[model samples]
Target: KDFQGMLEYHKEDEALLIRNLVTDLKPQMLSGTVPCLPAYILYMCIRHADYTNDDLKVHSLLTSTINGIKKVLKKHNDDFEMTSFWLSNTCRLLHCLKQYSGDEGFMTQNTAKQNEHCLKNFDLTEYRQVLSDLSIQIYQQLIKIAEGVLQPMIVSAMLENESYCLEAIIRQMNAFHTVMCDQGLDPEIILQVFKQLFYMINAVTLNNLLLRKDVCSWSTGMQLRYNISQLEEWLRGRNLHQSGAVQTMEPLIQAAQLLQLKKKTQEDAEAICSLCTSLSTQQIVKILNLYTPVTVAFIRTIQAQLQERNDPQQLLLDAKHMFPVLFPFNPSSLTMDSIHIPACLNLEFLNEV
Candidate 1:
C-alpha cells in the first residue's frame, strides 16, 4: 500500500521509496537468508537510479550495496546456490557500473557520504575478484554437467560410430563455452574442459572427424579443428610424441598424410607404392602396429596392382620414376618379401632369387 501510495504522488516519491526499501533490505540481503528478492530489488534500484541520472544518491547507494553484496559473496563462497545468486546480481551491478561510471575517474561527492571514489579504486578490484571466483566455480560446475551429458555419448560414438551423440556432445560443449564467455570468463579455460575428454575420444572417431572434407562448414568443422589442436597441444605438453595412448592413431595419421601427398587423386595402389618407397620398412611397421586393417588393405591393394603386371618390380620402378620423392631405398631394401606384415594378413612373398 505504501509503495502504491508513493507511486501516486510523483516519480521522485517512488524513487525515494525504492531507495528506502533498498536500504532496509541491505542487511537481510547481506545475510544468507532472504537474499534473492532484496538483491534483485537492489539491482533494479541501481539500474533505475542510473537511468534517472540521480547521480549522488544512486551512486552512493550502489557503492554501499555493492560492497555489502561482495561481503555476502565472500561469506557464501562455498555455497553454490547462494554464490550463483550473488554472482548474477554482481554481473548486473557491473553492467550498471560500466554504464554510469565509465569504469574509472568517478568521484562520489554526495552530500551525505562526503568525498569518495568507489568506481576507480579498491572497490572494482573486489568486484572483479568476486566475479572471477564465482566464474571459476560456475565454470567447474558447468563442466561437470557437460561431462555427465557426454559420458554415455562417448561410448555410443566410439562403439556404434554414432555421429548424433558426438554432434550433441559438441553442441553442448560449444554452448557451455558461450555461457562462460558471456559471464566474463577466460576462454582459454576451455582447454581444460577439452583435456578431460582427450582419453575418452576414440582414435577412430577422432580420425574420422579430422579427415572429413565435407565437414568444412561453419559449425562442426571449426570446433573439430579447435579440439584437434587442443589435443595436439595437450599431447605435446605430456612429451609423448607418437606412442602410448596416441600410438593407435599412427595408421590414421599416416593415411591422412598420404592422401594429402597425393592430393586425393591417386589410387590406393599407387599411393601405397609411393608411401612404401619413401617411408622405411621400420617406419611403416611402426605405423602398422594396430589391428592393421587399413594398413593391410593398403598393402594388399598395392600388391594386387603389382600382380596385374607381368613385371611387378617394373611397376614399382615406374612408381619411383614417376615420383622421384619416392624409392630412396636400394633395390634390396625395396623388396616386398622382406617386409614383416601383421598376422592378420596371411601371405608370403618369394624374394627375388
Candidate 2:
C-alpha cells in the first residue's frame, strides 16, 4: 500500500536501513536464533551489486549479514539447519527465477565477504563451497554452449586454465540434462571431456595439468587428479556404483578409491614448471624427485620388456598402441612411429584394463 513511501525511505536512509536490518538480524543469524540461508543469499547479492559511494555501507552490512549466516550454518542445529533450505530452496530461488525468466537475471553471489571471513578464520571448507558453485555455473554454461556449437572456442579457453576448466567442463557435461540435445550444443563435449581427461592424464598432456596453480587452488589440483583417477577407475571397473555418492559426485568426485597418478605427475610437473623458471639444477632435482622413482621404474620396465622383442615386433607393437586413438580425429598428431608400441598393450588397456 505504501510502496513509494517505503522505497523513498529506503533510498534516502538506505545505509541506516541496511545497517539496522543486518544488525538486528546478526545476533539471531550468528547466534543460531534464526535461519541464515536467506540472509546469506541476500548478503551475496548485496555485496556483489554495484554500489555508489553513499551505498558502500551496504557492503559492510551485507558482509556482516553473510558472516552471521555462515556462523549459524556451520554448526547449525536441526532447528537451525538453514543450509538444507539454502541449497534446496533459497539458493535455487534466484536460479529458478532466472530459468523461468529465460536466464535474464544478472545477480551474483559475493565471495569477497566469504573470502575475507575465511582468511581470518582460515578454515575454507565451509565457505569454499561458494567457489565450487561458481565454477560449476561456468562449467555448465560452457558445456551447454559447446553442445550447440559445431566448433567450440571455449575448449581453447578452457585449455588456458586446463585443470579447473577441464574439471568445470567435465563436471557439467557429466551431469548435464539429456534434454540439452534439443539445443544446438553437441553432446560431443561428453566425449571431448573424456578425451581431455584421458589426455591431461595420458602419456603426453598429463604433465601440463599436473602443475599446481597455488596452495589455495591445490585442493582443486587434488580434485582434478581425483576426477582423472575416477575416469580411469570407471573405465577399469566398467561396473562402478553408478547410483550413490559415486554417481552423485561424478560431476565433482569421480572415484574415491581410484589411485592418483595424476597427482603424483602434477606434483612433478609443478616442480618442473617452477624449477625451469629459476634454472637451478638443484631445484630441478627437487622437482624430479616427485617422479624419479616412477620414471626410473618405468625406464627399467621398458628396457627389460624391449630387450625381449625383436625390432619388427617392437615396431609393430608401438604402431598399434599410439596410432588408432589419433588417426581419425587428430590425424596430424599421428605419425608412422605413433603405433610403434605393442598393439597388444593398446588392446590390453581397452580390454583387460
Candidate 3:
C-alpha cells in the first residue's frame, strides 16, 4: 500500500512549498492583482488528497503550511515588506480554501469553472477546521507584529510631509476620500474619523508633536495660515464642507494670526481677542507664550481676560474634548424617474418616465 512512501512525499513538499514562498522575494508583476498564486497552487495539493480520499494528507500539508509561515514570520517580523506580503497572501489562501471547500456558502460567487474545480467530495469540517483556526492564528499574530512596524512611519507621514505642504494635507484627505468613496464607506463614519484626527492634532502636547520651539517661529505661522486655508479648500472640494472642517481647525488658524501679530502691545492684544473668540484664553496665552518668550505684557492681557466671568478652568480648553459630528445625509433622488425609454424602442405605452 506504500503507506509511508506516499505519506512521506506530502511531508517534504508541504514544507518545501512554504519555505520557497517565505524566501521568494520578488516584485508583484501587476500591482493590485488578486495576490494569490500560492493559494491557487495550494488548493490543488489539497484537491489531490480529496480526490483520493486521503484525509490525513489534507490535514498534514496544512499544518506544515501554517507552522512554516509562523516559524518564518516570527523570524522576519521586523521587515514590513515581507511581513505585509505574507499577510496579503495568507488571507487570500484562506479565502480560496473556503471557496473550494465544496460549501454552498462560499459557492455563490464562484464562476462555473471554479465551481467545477471544487473538491470532488469532502466533509472534514471538524477535521479541516482545525487548520482554519491555525491559519487565522498565524494571521492574527502576523498583523500585530507588522502593524507595529508601520505605526512609526505613518505617524510622521502626517507631520513631516505636511510641514510645508498643504497639498500634502489635501492629498492626505484625498487618499482618505479614495479609500472612503472608492469603497463607499459610510459618510457619517468618515466624519467620525476626522473628528478624532482633529482632536488628536489639536490636543496633543505641542512641544513634542508640533515641534514646538522652532514651529512657533514667524515662518511657521505664515506657512501654516496658507497650509490651513488650502486644507479648508480641500475639505470643500470634497463633500464635507458642512462637516465641522472649518470649526475644528479654527484652533490652529488663530495661532497663525497670533503668531503673525506684533506682540507686546495693547492694540495687538485687542486684535488677538477679536480674531480668537473660538480659541480659549489659556490656548492664546499658551501660544502667545510660545514665540514671545519676553512678551509677558502681551500674555498678561489675555491672562487678564481669563480673570473675567468664566471659570478659569474653562479658559483651559480640554483639547481632548470631542466636537459633535453632524450628519449630512442628502439622499440620492431616483425612483420612477430614474429610467426612461428613449423612444428608439418605439414603445408608446410606457409613460412612467
- On TM-score, the candidate that comes out on top is 3
Ranked candidates, highest lDDT first: 3, 1, 2
Name every residue pair that clashes in candidate 3.
none
**TM-scores of the models, in the given order?**
0.32, 0.22, 0.47
Tens-digit lDDT track of model 2 for 1-353: 21110011233344344444333323223312123223233323332232223344443443454444344444433321133233222233222222221211221332332222111211223323443353233333333333433123222323244424444544444443222222212233233333432332232222222232211133333654555555556544433233122322232222111112233344543433332331223222222333311355433333333332222221101111211111011101111111222232111211110
Worst 10 residues of 1 by lDDT: 323-332
* Candidate 3 residue lDDT tens string, 78-176: 653444455445544555566666478767776665666567667655534654555445434433443343334332433343432444445555654
lDDT of 2: 0.30
Q: Model 2, poorest ten-residue lDDT window?
A: 324-333
Task: Evaluate all candidate structures by whole-model CA lDDT and list the values in order.
Answer: 0.38, 0.30, 0.52
Residue 338 shift from truth in candidate 1, angstroms: 83
Best by lDDT: 3
The lDDT of model 1 is: 0.38
Cα distance off (Å), candidate 1, residue 288 = 3.8
Give candidate 1 misplaced runs (Cα > 4 Å).
1-41, 44-90, 101-124, 162-164, 167-287, 294-353
Ranked by lDDT, the better of candidates 2 and 3 is 3
